[PDB]
Write a protein that binds this ligand. Structure first.
Ligand SMILES: Cc1cc2nc3c(=O)[nH]c(=O)nc-3n(C[C@H](O)[C@H](O)[C@H](O)COP(=O)(O)OP(=O)(O)OC[C@H]3O[C@@H](n4cnc5c(N)ncnc54)[C@H](O)[C@@H]3O)c2cc1C
Ligand SMILES: Cc1cc2nc3c(=O)[nH]c(=O)nc-3n(C[C@H](O)[C@H](O)[C@H](O)COP(=O)(O)OP(=O)(O)OC[C@H]3O[C@@H](n4cnc5c(N)ncnc54)[C@H](O)[C@@H]3O)c2cc1C
Ligand SMILES: NC(=O)c1ccc[n+]([C@@H]2O[C@H](COP(=O)([O-])OP(=O)(O)OC[C@H]3O[C@@H](n4cnc5c(N)ncnc54)[C@H](O)[C@@H]3O)[C@@H](O)[C@H]2O)c1
Ligand SMILES: NC(=O)c1ccc[n+]([C@@H]2O[C@H](COP(=O)([O-])OP(=O)(O)OC[C@H]3O[C@@H](n4cnc5c(N)ncnc54)[C@H](O)[C@@H]3O)[C@@H](O)[C@H]2O)c1
Lengths: 435, 445
């Protein structure tokens, strides 16, 4: 069996890639081999607006109100927008098929071939590894019993949302382990639901505050406070030593000694780029950033690009990196799809991300947004309600967070791009309508 | 604003081998080598070896040397006639290889597929190879030294350096070689060979315990140094230069250890700096570990940019990311880059190797990860890295460089015609129960 564009993984980058492949190559035959039985869907509403919707039937429909009151599905497109795997090689105008429930287990890079779990083989011409990541689990939950594992869940998928929101109607306490994006958003989502249902929502993580890897300390702190205000028990500086079952419920034991009892743990502890295919593939992984080491164009080897969460790419302006964001999956998937159809475009228009942690934390971020970098923050009118945060390297702005600053990403994009050695970052903040 | 389908930046071995690879695979390919060096692509090995062993009084003029068979050879890869001019290249039937000598690419516009040269001219390309090699590192002790001393201290890389140094070897009472690596050792041996007739004082000083300390296990390095001494070299191992000045009309090297060397001339053979200036304007990734441009298994940097030779930091699928600065590697990587520039999509796979000679008792070959930082097992004939030997005569043997219970590198020590065995051993990743049984494969028994 053969397909021109084999997108390994049925996610956002694969869909964006399938879309940009199809935008750039309107006849393209794209087989998404998706080990997931679900058709591609955006993950963000699984931790945001799928929770915000009225209608108990939201869980079945998987539909959500957008920023304007217009509703839409989590699925990138109706199932009827896809052609079947069997029809894919034959259907006129090509299309996008998803072989759902099938996993690529061997990447014969030399042979441009994948072997699936069912022993079946598919060759390809262009391959996007858009395998994303699997939620890292906690060492403590792996070494724990069959009982605790049956009530600890990872969160990535529709089934995780469905399990979790069902659980959110069934149990009285859900603990989110992880202080990054997903922890913080699931915290807030569950927080919002707890307004009407009264469920306990605990969020816990090793850093000083939410988004610790991302936000400078002062701002990570201001944010944690906003997440708390969403109805979340936020527990920073938390390292899990072990997890057991106790009194029907789960008992999480922290290194510092604190202990969380909860009915259900969601561990959002970062992502392991799914690089299993590298070994048989002879593909280089980045030992620093993880993921498949790819260049500015998302390319690993001649016919293999990697996009989305699994891609460790070179940013010409910002250096080598890996980014795990929907818009990056979209941007890099789109880019890889463009590059898979020959754009030879380096990553350049920066992917951004946004996060909402309640109504007072709406931010957008671009570039090297890493709390390990020097930063300069300038804020309106400590009150960090509105401001702009500059991540700096070699006397130059390398990352920007637009903090409740709306409609200014263009300006941020421009500062990142220009590598100006700013005489006065206070004058630069004024560009973001921060005085 | 000219254009060339294949642009190779740098006019050395890698560029040459890429040129001939591109040409082999894409016959009729038009390939422009841009070379800041006024000289055409030449091989550097004889500059430290056979051009000194020549007793031809004209060898500095001719740059010719006799090979193994006694057949004479130029250090140039091919004669100047075998290249097309840069003007003729866009047009010449079935393309070929042009060299823009004395021209430095000073800007690489990767987006616009373009380079800008030092005279301000621009060249677009379809596929580009960066093969800029490296430039000898200088000793900062010389850099900070005065005008007089600097003008009596030479780097050694190029034909010009051979000529200057060989001239100096007939004028002065004493030359000091600084550096104990490949080039220092070979030049010291070269000069020592010379001193048997000239009575010139030949001194070699380097920080390592013995010659070739970065690649040979110590016992072998030491044995090698004794062989170098016996070449008529005052070998001063363990030497780090503190300052160089002028005293009594002669150079005065002051070593950190307090030794002084009064000498008339200094050559500093202190390693190579990969030439990566174009990464900057190019927005090309440099490898901060190995130095050089960072490229994949296929030696590819960007859609249309590859890198090869001393300047290429590449991914070895079986052995990992590396950069090698060896003639045969410049050959192997240039060859491969060339192939990939022409669609081959092939990973580095066939391993390059190297060799060195330090007088008549020291001739060796090496393949894979040959690095005195690796564990080694050496097996020799009767007559902090682990350095094992299998039962002071290190006249002949095989040295296995190990990683992950697998041979990842091999040195064949006065063992000739066994590289393919070494190579298979490297390739097969067998976990050998008995390296003495493996050494039997090398006629060590
Ligand atoms: C709940 C949630 C919410 C988010 N919200 C936001 C947000 O608001 N803003 C933001 O910027 N980012 C957000 N993100 C991050 C964003 O969704 C990810 O960056 C994005 O999903 C990356 O997509 P991907 O296609 O690279 O990987 P994935 O979406 O992980 O898709 C990869 C797919 O490939 C499959 N796969 C793996 N290996 C194989 C194999 N060998 N064979 C076949 N299939 C395989 C996996 O099962 C998976 O289905 C969110 C993520 C989650 C999980
Ligand atoms: C005296 C000597 C002896 C050696 N003996 C041995 C040996 O016995 N065995 C062995 O294995 N190896 C030996 N080597 C090492 C071997 O010669 C090198 O590995 C090989 O020369 C590397 O080839 P290259 O093409 O990568 O780089 P180089 O040969 O350095 O060629 C690069 C060329 O590109 C030019 N260049 C740089 N930047 C630009 C630019 N921007 N624009 C245009 N041109 C540019 C440089 O000036 C240079 O001329 C020896 C080296 C020397 C110096
Ligand atoms: N708006 C958004 O950008 C958004 C929203 C939801 C999800 N996501 C994405 O979803 C993916 C998964 O999200 P995530 O939040 O799990 O990852 P993340 O990288 O955002 O955060 C990882 C967090 O896990 C925690 N962690 C790491 N090691 C730990 C350890 N061993 N023990 C306990 N905690 C540990 C830390 O708190 C760390 O900040 C990420 O790729 C993320 O980018 C993004
Ligand atoms: N047979 C061969 O493979 C061969 C022969 C000659 C030259 N070469 C090549 O030529 C290039 C240059 O040769 P090289 O011998 O200069 O490089 P090298 O890397 O082989 O040796 C560097 C040596 O320089 C000396 N050194 C480094 N820093 C020093 C310091 N600051 N002070 C004093 N000494 C210092 C050390 O002895 C070290 O071994 C290399 O790329 C090398 O591979 C190879």
């Amino acid at each position: 069996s053969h397909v021109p564009f084999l997108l390994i993984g049925g996610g956002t980058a694969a869909f964006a890639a399938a879309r940009s492949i199809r935008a750039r190559d309107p006849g393209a035959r794209v087989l998404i081999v998706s080990e997931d039985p679900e058709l591609p869907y955006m993950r963000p509403p699984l931790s945001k607006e799928l929770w915000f919707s009225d209608d108990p039937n939201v869980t079945k429909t998987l539909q959500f109100r957008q920023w304007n009151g217009k509703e839409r599905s989590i699925y990138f497109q109706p199932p009827s927008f896809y052609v079947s795997a069997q029809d894919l090689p034959n259907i006129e105008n090509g299309g996008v098929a998803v072989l759902t429930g099938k996993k690529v287990v061997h990447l014969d890079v030399r042979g441009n071939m994948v072997k699936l779990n069912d022993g079946s083989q598919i060759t390809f011409e262009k391959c996007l590894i858009a395998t994303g990541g699997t939620p890292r689990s906690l060492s403590a939950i792996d070494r724990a019993g069959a009982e605790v594992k049956s009530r600890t869940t990872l969160f990535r998928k529709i089934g995780d949302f469905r399990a979790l929101e069902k659980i959110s109607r069934e149990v009285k306490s859900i603990t989110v382990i992880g202080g990054g994006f997903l922890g913080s958003e699931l915290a807030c989502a569950l927080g919002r639901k707890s307004q009407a249902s009264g469920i306990e929502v605990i969020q816990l993580f090793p850093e000083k505050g939410n988004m610790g890897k991302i936000l400078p300390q002062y701002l990570s702190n201001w944010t944690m406070e906003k997440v708390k205000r969403e109805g979340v028990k936020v527990m920073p500086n938390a390292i899990v030593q072990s997890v057991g079952v106790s009194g029907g419920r789960l008992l999480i034991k922290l290194k510092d000694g604190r202990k969380v009892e909860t009915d259900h743990i969601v561990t959002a502890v970062g992502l392991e780029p799914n690089v299993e295919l590298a070994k048989t593939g002879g593909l280089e992984i980045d030992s620093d950033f993880g993921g498949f080491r790819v260049n500015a164009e998302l390319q690993a080897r001649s016919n293999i690009w990697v996009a989305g969460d699994a891609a460790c790419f070179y940013d010409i302006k910002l250096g080598r990196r890996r980014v795990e964001h929907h818009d990056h999956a979209v941007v890099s998937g789109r880019l890889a799809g463009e590059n898979m159809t020959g754009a030879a475009k380096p990553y350049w228009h920066q992917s951004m991300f946004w996060s909402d942690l309640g109504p007072d934390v709406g931010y957008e971020a671009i570039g090297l947004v890493d709390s390990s970098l020097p930063t300069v923050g300038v804020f309106a009118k400590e009150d960090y309600g509105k401001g702009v945060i500059f991540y700096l390297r070699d006397k130059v702005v390398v990352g920007i967070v637009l903090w409740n600053v709306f409609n200014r990403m263009p300006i941020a994009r421009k500062i990142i791009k220009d590598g100006e050695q700013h005489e006065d970052l206070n004058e630069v903040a004024k560009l973001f309508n921060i005085h």
